[PDB]
Structure formats: C-alpha cells, structure tokens
Design a protein around this ligand. Structure first.
Ligand code: GTP
Ligand code: GTP
Ligand code: GTP
Ligand code: MG
Ligand code: MG
Ligand code: MG
Length: 562
C-alpha cells in the first residue's frame, strides 16, 4: 500500500515564487545575513515527493484495539451539530483559494448567489453519491526557513493537497462541530490544542513535578501524513459516527471519507494528473483532528507495549511528547526502543530515534520548551519559549514582503514573555508599524492553524490575559535560553540586544506621545527598556477582550477563519 503513486507530472506553481529573502531597509535592520534565509518553492517538490512515497505495513494488536475501544466509548458522549451553509460560509478566510466553478472566497463570505448555489449542489451530490473520488489539487508550500548546513542544507517544499472551495464549505457543514469537540472529549488533558501557551506550560510542569523521577521524550514520526493508512482513515470515520449526529451529517461524513479523506486523484495547478493519494490529505478540515486522534491511539497503545509507567502524553496533530515515571537509565532506554518498535508496527516509524530526557527544559513539544525566569520579587516564573531562528527569519521576510497571514503577530502573542519576542520582535514590529503609519491597521495571523484578525494596538491586554502581568517584567532568564538567543543573533546577523534596547527606547517614546492604546503599548511592552521603570498595574481593557475560542482546537490545513 503505497502512500502515493505518481504519473511523472510536476507539481507546478500558480504564481511567481521568490526563493531568496528580498533586500529591504527595514527587513535588513532586523537581520543582515539575508543569504541564509530562503523560501521553499515548487522547484524542490520532486525531492519531497520521493521522501513522502513509501509502502505502509501495519500490524494492529490487542493494545491498539483496547485503546480504540476507549476512544469510541469517549466519542459516544459527544453531540455535534450540522452547520448551515451560511454559518460555514462565514468560516471561510478572505484569502482562501478560489473555486474552479466561477467564484472565490469573497463571494462565499458575502453569501453571493452563484457561490451558495454551487455549494448547495456539492452538498446534494455528497448525499447522493458515496463512492466517486473527489478531485484534489496538489501544490508546493512556500514557507520560509534559515539554512542549516550541518543538517543537509535546504528543506524541500512541503506538499499540500486540498479540494475545491465548494467542497471545503461542505466539510465545514458536516464536520466543523465534530473536529471542534471530538479530540478533547476523547483524550481529555492530552489534547494539546485546548491550551494557551501558559496553560501548556502549566500542564507540562505539573506532569513533570508529579513524577518521583521524571523522564520525558518527544517522538518524531517520519512523514506522519504518509504513514496514515486507508484503514486509519476509515477508523477515524467510525469514531466520528460514534457521536450523536444529524442523519444528513452521517451521510455526508461517510461520503467525504470514501470520496476524499481515504484517497483520491491529484491534479497540479495546470490541470495535469499528478498521481493518486492513499494517505492523509494535508489540506482538509479533518487533517488536524484526524492526525491528533490517530497519533493519540497509536502512541497510547505504544506506551503500553513499551511498559512505560504513569505516562502523561501531550498530542498536537503528529507532535507527541510523553512524560513518565523513570525506571532507571538502562530501563528507560530499553522502553523507548520498545515504544519505537510498537509505533513502527502501527505504521509510524521515527525520523530520528527518540531519546530519554531528564531535564524539563530539554523536552521540546511543537518546537517549543518550558523555561524559567523570575519576577521582580525573585519568584520563579515558568514560560513557553523556542529557538528564535525560524520566527526571526519569517519576521524578516514579512517585513520585506506583504503576506496574507503574518507569522510574527502570532509569534509575539504565543511567545510574549520570552527575551527574544520582547526585545527583538516587539521593538522591530512597532518600529515598522510606526515607520509605515500602520499602527491602527488590523492584521491576519494564525493561531493553531485558524486565521484571526488582530489589532497590534491590542497586544498589551491580550498578553496580560494569556500570560499575566508578569510577562511585562520577567528578568534573570536561564543560561541555556540566553545562550540560545545569543547564538541565533550571531548566526542571522541580528543586532545585539543592547542595540535593540536603544531602539526600543525610541519606539517607546513615540508610542507614549500618541496616547491612548499606543501609549499603553509603550508603557507595558517596553518597560524593560528604560532605566527608571514604571509601575505596571492590571490593564482595564483586558477583561473586556473577547478571546472566546482562542487556543481551543487545532485547524491547520482546515481553511478556518475566526
Ligand atoms: N479515556 C477514556 N476512556 C473511557 C471513556 N469512557 C469509557 N472509557 C473506557 O473505554 C473502555 C471501553 O468501554 P466499554 O466497552 O463501553 O466498557 P464496558 O461497557 O464496561 O465494556 P468493557 O470495557 O469491555 O468491559 C472502558 O474500559 C472504559 O474505561 C472516556 O470518556 N475516556
Ligand atoms: N503532518 C504535517 N505537518 C506539517 C505540515 N505542514 C507543516 N507541518 C509541521 O511540520 C511538522 C513535522 O515536521 P518534521 O517532524 O520535521 O518532518 P518533516 O515535515 O517531513 O520535515 P523534515 O524534518 O525535514 O523531514 C509538524 O509537526 C507540523 O508542525 C503538514 O502539511 N502536515
Ligand atoms: N496544510 C497543513 N498545514 C499545517 C499542518 N500542520 C501545521 N501546518 C501549518 O504549517 C505552517 C508552518 O508550520 P510551523 O508550525 O511554523 O512549523 P515549521 O514550518 O516546521 O517551523 P518550526 O516549527 O519552527 O520548525 C503553519 O502555518 C501551520 O499552521 C497540517 O497538518 N496541514
Ligand atoms: Mg515528523
Ligand atoms: Mg534533571
Ligand atoms: Mg518544524
């Protein structure tokens, strides 16, 4: 059972693709080593195709079946509703790919007659035909990275596979409520997307503290989407059907499963037949929920096979971290080998073998880790951080070029307490918004795969709400964290922190002079930058922010706008 079969046709671009970071005075002011920053393009798709194409051998055992029974039992408690066409239309992002049937995202969002007509016809066809494969488009993702020579140079483009806009709206109708509710019901505290960054830290720290001698590891499945089998996808359908659903939803979900999720033909942007998929599509509404469920089932069963004691797992799509009670160094190492062997039997071998870790800060989940800093009183404060290389590289690109959805604002929100987000990202972007007179302009950004419209001037109350008041006064960061930041700045040609402090003092002064929300930004975000610090009291407007639904479910690949 090959994940893909290919015809030899190329994955083709739909527009001009830039490979190299453009030179721009403002981007260069953030980082000068522009030759290290690149975007993936369709040019490397062949290399990706090779990597993602393989045979899946899958052997399920008693542990697998025991866990599946638990999951189905949990699912039976869920009630999920159909969304109306109108409701689903409104979840469509302004930048979603247009339909081949004569309408686009804007038409969907304004409920235009042509769009709604077609959507209704697609729905009727899902109800009447449960068999005919639905077409999909395959594209190469254009995503920005920094080169890492020691690690093979440049990453090939990821491939995304997605159906027509009409179909995407129907997926929302049938499954939006299901994918928004089911993971949590099934795996409880193990579902990672229910947590804001601070809540994720709280979960990991308590798990770590709860063990007599904790041991943790991350498990990296090689090409997770390709490892997902037809039977895995049909099992996901069986799980969805355990919920209390509307009768039409049951039919639609079965049709979507057999016609779209389980596999189908791949067409490139030029209309050429590229091949056929028999694994997870990366650009459907169920990508995140499906990957999370399937990862959880296999991992939980594999923990049992591995004889791991008192396991706590955190699962976000294909990203898995496990914290358990150590049985000793040799014992733990052997258990991880057994865990890997089990995961391999279930179709999910690792890229690189997992390694047992015995320090909390060294455990990396969704490219992030827990670290410790201190508040003004010397109290330890735990917070979520990560290596700043990718965030800075993308921030540079987004300064040089207008992008539909900007990673930098999401990164500031997620990583607000970090030394690097505070001193570099905040200083940089407020200076940019000041230069361009864009302080008042709302921006699109992503949080767990869903697109939000956020006003940069609302950052302080947002940060207080998610991270607490201490986010604006952390100091005495860890040696490992300081060193990681320092190494990154050297690599990328980013000015040193003391230079950013000077720049921040100027940014702060300009914001203060504007009064209102701008002044609150200057006061709270940049208190670290002045000699005589202000007293920061709770921000009034904080409680009035509607953060409903932020950090509650994963929607990567799902074409969701909130
Ligand atoms: N994690 C989790 N497990 C659950 C949940 N609900 C039920 N289970 C477990 O799932 C297992 C299978 O469920 P059932 O087959 O319905 O349990 P049963 O009806 O008593 O039948 P047996 O378990 O086979 O004896 C049970 O052992 C439960 O402990 C849940 O909400 N979350
Ligand atoms: N499964 C999946 N993950 C994606 C996709 N796009 C971005 N990602 C992210 O990529 C991560 C997986 O990266 P890796 O474990 O490094 O594997 P990889 O994507 O093949 O990249 P390499 O390490 O170069 O092999 C996931 O955890 C996601 O956070 C996607 O379309 N599907
Ligand atoms: N289509 C699709 N996109 C995904 C999936 N998982 C993650 N993504 C998106 O891929 C983009 C890049 O993923 P990131 O979370 O930044 O991970 P990354 O590109 O490997 O970069 P690092 O985490 O820093 O290593 C983000 O916008 C994610 O929302 C997926 O399963 N399908
Ligand atoms: Mg992986
Ligand atoms: Mg230790
Ligand atoms: Mg990554």
């Amino acid at each position: 059972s090959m994940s893909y079969s290919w015809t030899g046709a190329l994955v083709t671009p739909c527009a001009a693709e830039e490979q190299k970071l453009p030179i721009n005075a403002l981007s260069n002011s953030l980082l000068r080593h522009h030759n290290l920053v690149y975007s993936t393009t369709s040019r490397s798709a062949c290399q990706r195709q090779k990597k993602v194409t393989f045979d899946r051998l899958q052997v399920l055992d008693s542990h697998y079946h025991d866990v599946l029974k638990e999951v189905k039992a949990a699912a039976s408690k869920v009630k999920a509703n159909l969304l109306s066409v109108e409701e689903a239309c409104s979840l469509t992002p302004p930048h979603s790919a247009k339909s081949k049937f004569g309408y686009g995202a804007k038409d969907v969002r304004c409920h235009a007659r042509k769009a709604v007509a077609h959507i209704n016809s697609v729905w009727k066809d899902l109800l009447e035909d449960s068999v005919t494969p639905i077409d999909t488009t395959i594209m190469a993702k254009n995503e920005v990275f920094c080169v890492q020579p020691e690690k093979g140079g440049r990453k090939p483009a990821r491939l995304i596979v997605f159906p027509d806009l009409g179909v995407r709206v129907c997926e929302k109708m049938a499954l939006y409520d299901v994918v928004s509710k089911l993971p949590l019901a099934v795996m409880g505290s193990s579902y990672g997307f229910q947590y804001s960054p601070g809540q994720r830290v709280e979960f990991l720290v308590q798990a770590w503290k709860s063990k007599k001698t904790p041991m943790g590891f991350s498990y990296d499945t090689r090409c997770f989407d390709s490892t997902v089998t037809e039977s895995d996808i049909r099992t996901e359908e069986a799980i969805y059907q355990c919920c209390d659903l509307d009768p039409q939803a049951r039919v639609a979900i079965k049709s979507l499963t057999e016609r779209l999720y389980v596999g189908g033909p791949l067409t490139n942007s030029r209309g050429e037949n590229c091949g056929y998929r028999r694994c997870r599509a990366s650009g459907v509404l169920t990508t995140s929920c499906g990957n999370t469920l399937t990862c959880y089932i296999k991992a939980r069963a594999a923990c049992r096979a591995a004889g791991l004691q008192d396991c706590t797992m955190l699962v976000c799509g294909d990203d898995l971290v496990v914290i358990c009670e150590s049985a000793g160094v040799q014992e733990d190492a052997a258990s991880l080998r057994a865990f890997t062997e089990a995961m391999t039997r279930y179709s999910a071998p690792p890229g690189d073998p997992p390694q047992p870790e015995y320090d909390l800060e060294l455990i990396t989940s969704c490219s992030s880790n827990v670290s410790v800093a201190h508040d003004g009183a010397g109290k330890r404060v735990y917070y979520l951080t990560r290596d700043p290389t990718t965030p800075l590289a993308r921030a540079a690109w987004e300064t040089a070029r207008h992008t539909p959805v900007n990673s930098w604002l999401g990164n500031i929100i997620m990583f607000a307490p970090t030394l690097w987000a505070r001193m570099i990202l905040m200083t940089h972007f407020f200076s940019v918004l000041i230069a361009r007179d864009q302080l008042e302009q709302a921006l699109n950004c992503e949080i767990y795969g869903a697109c939000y419209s956020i006003e940069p001037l609302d950052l302080p109350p947002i940060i207080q709400r998610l991270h607490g008041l201490s986010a604006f006064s952390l100091h005495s960061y860890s040696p490992g964290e300081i060193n990681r930041v320092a190494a990154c700045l050297r690599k990328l040609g980013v000015p040193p922190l003391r230079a950013w402090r000077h720049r921040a003092r100027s940014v702060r002064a300009r914001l203060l002079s504007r009064g209102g929300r701008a002044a609150i930004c200057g006061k709270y975000l940049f208190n670290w930058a002045v000699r005589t610090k202000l007293k920061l009291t709770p921000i009034a407007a904080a409680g009035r922010l509607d953060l409903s639904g932020w950090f509650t479910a994963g929607y990567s690949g799902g074409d969701i706008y909130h």
